[PDB]
Symmetry: D2
Subunit: 460 residues, 4 copies
């Protein structure tokens, strides 16, 4: 990762998985440059430019044989990123030197590489998000019936289930999964367009034949594995593309942050905890992996303003005031999302529920929500008011003298509630207060979640 004598990005050197790091590495970047020049030359041969099979063979064998030292020093001399690599690749491919980058300009390698990078980055996030959704869905099913105190205003609300509450987190990740897939499939190749998008150099190279330029653009698009290319660009693809991508990651950021806020709140209530590793026979447990996910999700929300501002200040066919900003924020958003999903998969595998803790809290709150079922079970005016005064004193005891709720007791002795004694244990059954929470979990998993997850069954 490098020396401690200098600053190191905590995302690469500490947080993110090596795979995502490699996608944004200089090796991947410059390999892809060489790959693009190969596809270019191959297509140009087919279209009748003087390129031999020996020159193609030379380029194919030397895609990974990159001299970084020599390339960086040639940049210093030629003050050009692309020209330096054209020359370097030429030195290790002496037969091909005269045909590399023929007709093209800088953005053929620069911009198309970012597109290939963008796509590859989404492709690694997809199964990670799919794997989180699946494990939460496992958990959702097991705890689909378990009654838990609902919360609105973070206050005692009617009963829900742990499996129901989990399905709220799952659905947000599902909207995100659908969004990531939609953006990945819509990405288009820039292809060959020239300095200003007019294909003027390539038109001159193919001595004025429009049809040949059209074919060239089709051929590299397909070699690159892209279904579609832009008809219209300036020098580069429209920077709107980066907004579309980072908007969805920002949206994922906000969903994750919400999931982790919930878990941190439940971990205070002792109702649920993060998984442990290295475990066996501490009381105090910090939800550190959830606090980490929040911290990083935040940064993922912040980054969306960068591509927005960039897109707004692009003058005409392009200005280079996007270049540096894009080298930073694109990498960060993906490495940030990658980390979040790796850490979120850990949290989701074995979430620890504490049933008796959840049952205790419910018992403290249920007699204040069961009052209506007591009245509609007596066969109204003197039963709405005579139970109310008992609630007055029981609510006065809980707040003014912090402790247990004894409303059950106050009814269990009063003469007025004579017949309703025989049916109190059934009237205070927690599951009868949970509504369709169980039915809803089931139907959600079968109609929405399972159809979505199936294309990912190979890797779990």
């Amino acid at each position: 990762h490098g020396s401690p004598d200098s600053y190191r990005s905590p995302l690469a050197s500490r947080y993110a998985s090596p795979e995502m790091c490699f996608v944004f590495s200089d090796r991947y970047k410059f390999r892809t440059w060489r790959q693009l020049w190969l596809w270019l030359a191959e297509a140009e041969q087919t279209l009748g430019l003087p390129i031999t099979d020996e020159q193609i063979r030379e380029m194919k064998s030397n895609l990974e044989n990159i001299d970084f030292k020599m390339a960086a020093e040639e940049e210093k001399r030629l003050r050009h990123d692309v020209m330096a690599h054209v020359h370097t690749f030429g030195h290790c491919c002496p037969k091909a030197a005269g045909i590399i980058h023929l007709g093209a300009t800088s953005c053929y390698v620069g911009d198309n590489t970012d597109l290939i990078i963008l796509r590859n980055a989404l492709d690694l996030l997809l199964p990670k998000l799919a794997r989180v959704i699946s494990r939460l869905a496992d958990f959702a099913k097991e705890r689909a019936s378990l009654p838990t105190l609902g919360f609105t205003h973070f206050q005692p609300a009617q009963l829900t289930t742990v499996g129901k509450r989990c399905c709220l987190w799952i659905q947000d990740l599902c909207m995100d999964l659908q969004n990531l897939k939609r953006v990945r499939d819509d990405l288009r190749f820039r292809g060959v367009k020239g300095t200003t998008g007019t294909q003027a150099s390539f038109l001159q190279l193919f001595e004025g034949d429009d049809h040949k330029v059209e074919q060239l653009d089709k051929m590299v698009t397909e070699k690159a594995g892209f279904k579609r290319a832009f008809i219209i660009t300036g020098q580069t693809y429209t920077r709107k593309v980066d907004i579309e991508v980072l908007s969805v990651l920002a949206s994922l950021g906000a969903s994750v942050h919400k999931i982790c806020t919930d878990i941190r709140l439940l971990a205070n209530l002792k109702e649920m905890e993060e998984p442990f590793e290295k475990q066996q026979i501490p009381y105090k447990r910090n939800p550190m992996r959830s606090e980490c996910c929040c911290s990083l999700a935040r940064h993922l929300m912040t980054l969306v303003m960068d591509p927005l501002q960039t897109a707004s200040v692009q003058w005409f066919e392009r200005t280079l005031d996007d270049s540096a900003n894009r080298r930073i924020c694109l990498a960060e958003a993906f490495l940030t999302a990658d980390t979040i999903l790796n850490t979120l998969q850990n949290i989701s595998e074995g979430l620890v529920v504490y049933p008796k803790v959840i049952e205790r809290r419910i018992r403290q709150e249920l007699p204040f929500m069961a009052t209506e079922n007591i009245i509609m079970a007596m066969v109204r005016q003197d039963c709405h008011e005579k139970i109310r005064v008992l609630s007055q004193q029981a609510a006065s005891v809980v707040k003014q003298e912090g402790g247990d709720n004894d409303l059950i007791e106050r009814i269990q002795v009063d003469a007025y509630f004579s017949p309703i004694h025989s049916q109190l244990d059934h009237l205070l059954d927690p599951s009868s207060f949970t509504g369709r929470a169980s039915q809803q979990v089931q139907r959600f998993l079968e109609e929405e979640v399972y159809p979505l997850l199936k294309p990912y069954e190979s890797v779990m």
Copy 2:
């Protein structure tokens, strides 16, 4: 008055900027009508599932949907400090009263109203957006072959065409149209969910009947005009929907700002101007005032995206009420702003002024510096020499540059070539070698293909 008094603050978004249609969809009249419209649909679905509601009770609601007493509603809200219940009383006062809102909570009306408002607001933006695109398309077709100086780094570069440049704007607006359409299509109804989304109150109402509660959830969803309803909600629909909606407006703001920034730059170059207003010739100096307003307003949209993002991130459990005030402001203001922008942008597109002679004058100044490759190629074809020509053209290029920079004169490079003996085997070809049209690449063909494949197919559903 018909809006507000001068002695109080009035948002200029409502008073000075947006159209009456978009302003209506966010008004309290439309909001409280929609509340009554939801209560009506519920009662209809409730009766059709065998609940004790009379066909007379229904028609008293069906007739009194518009009849809203605004002073009584505000006083019962002064009494109970609860807006939904206050409107329940007021509707029952003019009606029936005992069957209003039965089994439902506040968010049956306060949350399904938002989704109807969002859907209708998107309905207002769509045809306005297609209209702009349509106008620019015609401008792009008309100007498809008019050579213009290309700009990278905002320095002169390979020529393009006005039509081609306009397609860059069109493309961005077409992606916005597609995103607005998708997000409107993907919008789902909350339906009947109860206080925490468990539907407990409606299960009680239908006496434990699971199938019946779901039958109600389907009935009110179709009545509201939605293809699909959420299975999973807390008290409200997920605040993620607000993010998808304002994300696409934010992106649209980005597009517009860029389009309008280009226009202001073109205006300075005097190559393009905004349409003429009337008088009773036109003035020499003209500020791109309408473009600057669009830029100003677009900026607001890009900013608003952070509101729904932060909101969604800190929603604890089934629901917290720290979304309420923030949503009252940012939802309406996003749409009101977008609406203003589209109205203004359409106005700009109707008769953009082009000045062909100014475009030509800038081209004649810059082109010779970009055309030396074509001069060398033409020499070699008639017995010339590459390195001899380069060095005997690099020197005249540096002389011409000096007059333009150090002296601030007109570019004389062509004139320096038109007399120089070394370039005698080329003099009959100089004007043809500097034909702007032969420098525009495939620009005009790109316009034609793009319009035929990607613009008219999208505009087809909006012909009227």
Copy 3:
């Protein structure tokens, strides 16, 4: 009119005084006010302006015809020239001398600076009054022990007043910031179309000193200590960044406080004056305040040269909204701070249910002094903790670590004063003393200039 949209901030949220500051009555009245000051200064410096013309203007500052002015703008397509003419119509004798030598931003930008300053002046007392009522609560509850929270997890005891000082300290930092931006706000003055004072220079036929003088006079009349030396058409949009930055910071502070109050309401240790609806309202609007900061940031980044008019419509929206939003928050925070209710028994319970686990060191250092070993006590205390933790977590019961230590024969010398070893006040450190010190050295001096009168 319910048949049209109304800004919730404007209608049914913010104070009538703040709404008035951003009203058009106040705006156009200030325009007229600034024209009079310009006329007054110009007479002094020797232009043909008569006292009659000046009295005509001083009488008609509030006499504004919004119908006429609005109709004349449609015809002239100029907001300032529309109001020059309207003012000239109700002051026929003044007509020719209004706005003499001036440009549009003389009224446009100096009005926005007058508005900003006056809007800050309304924010300062309200904030001070909030800080003052939290300081009383802080003093009242300085000694009351409460459970400290790190990671939202039980942590070393603090006091209620000490926790309140965390909130106070954030608000005080905002108070100093609002005051520093207010006091160091500068006047645009008279600058001309591009900032070069060219027309004023020609109006006084070349007299440089007369232009400086005119600039000084209007600046003093408007109640500012300094004018900008350098401007384009307008004052730098960096000023709007600095103002909205401090309000955004205040937003973040407020949001933190109201989130803390919302969690305590869940813990039933504290309640709002009679669902923490007001704190949710506060959080929701604090959030919108934080959002706004990107507007002037984006604006100032893309101003080309002496002025571009892409700031105009965005400023009309973000400026007023930030102050109306700020205002609303402070009015609501004042109502929360007026009736905060702590429930001491609920707090006492939670402590007793969590203190035993944190008190493990004090029992050891009472045992080691009694003869026992640090090895032979840490081992025995851990097995009894393992037993207590099961009852709480696996059985959802009461923390009986206090009971279990009384039945174990090992801790026999320790029995005599377990009341003292688990006395919550001994676990609070310097909390109360930290409160008294902070209030007297930092808070009270800051509130000293206010509270008057």
Copy 4:
């Protein structure tokens, strides 16, 4: 290598962009040095306060600040899960004599949180002279070009003439406000000191046997040694996260200014009026350095939402959900800012001005702005106002058509000069269109601004 292998992502801020000094400030070698330097200060102060620390232990501690075993600490961190105790052990290992008195009575954030504040302040100290240095270069330029008339620009349309030096003062003023805000925030930065787990100083009070006086003066001593004038009286576990908001707010604002300057330079580059420095070894020159600054400034403006959101959701005495966000955003903000200023210093050094392209654009626009001047000269010679205004009006329409509908030069002056009606002012015409008389007070505004504001603001930094 040391700047990372090409097989992994390497931040372009640390490797490619920022200066070495700023990179070292956020390096782990600086972080762990300071951690250890803070333990020394803690030990020295405690010994003075009567605790059992030997001067043998102080000297052993003082010698082993530089030599850090990173391999040991990382593996100890794996074994412990505590980053501080990992370095408490690794320090206690190489300093065996003083193993019992390292981190005595202290909490994790004594080193974590105070280090953050020390870095913040050293980073600000690197930025300030760099900012001053830039302002100073532009000042020189703005004095030199103080009387060079140039076309004013409102709406990006021709307007009343300013001077090149006056326009530069517009840029300088934004950077001077940035300088003022940076210094203030640097000086108003408070030390976290010794506060314990939740800010109550409980463990320190315990070790000083209930003595408040000794707690308070330990806080003051270590603050003094760290170089701070003032400590917080009130903290949770850490210093309030409102501090990070103040710091990144002023950087975002600097970013905003730098973006405006560089946008202006980019536009002037197109107009061929002004260019970025040569440093040669052509005709078309892209302003690549101004574009770099703009790109980097934009990111700086974006970062402000990090600390804002962070502060807004800090529950009670502290939550760890700020940790990861702060490591990225703070470091990145100072790396970017430093890079921007480095590039800005380079731009200021040898900015190229083209006086004859400036003169050309004036001659094209000025005649339209000089109409009232001409009518006044005509009336002064006993002429008719209404006839003169109508003549100018018609000649102005003809000349505008040539410019817009024919793409010609402005020929308004030549039309006036060949018209016999204008005979009374024909001799006055060169003088009437002297651009210098159209600049207002621009040349004096520069001198006043530089004397009264700039140089007094620069004096501490010379």
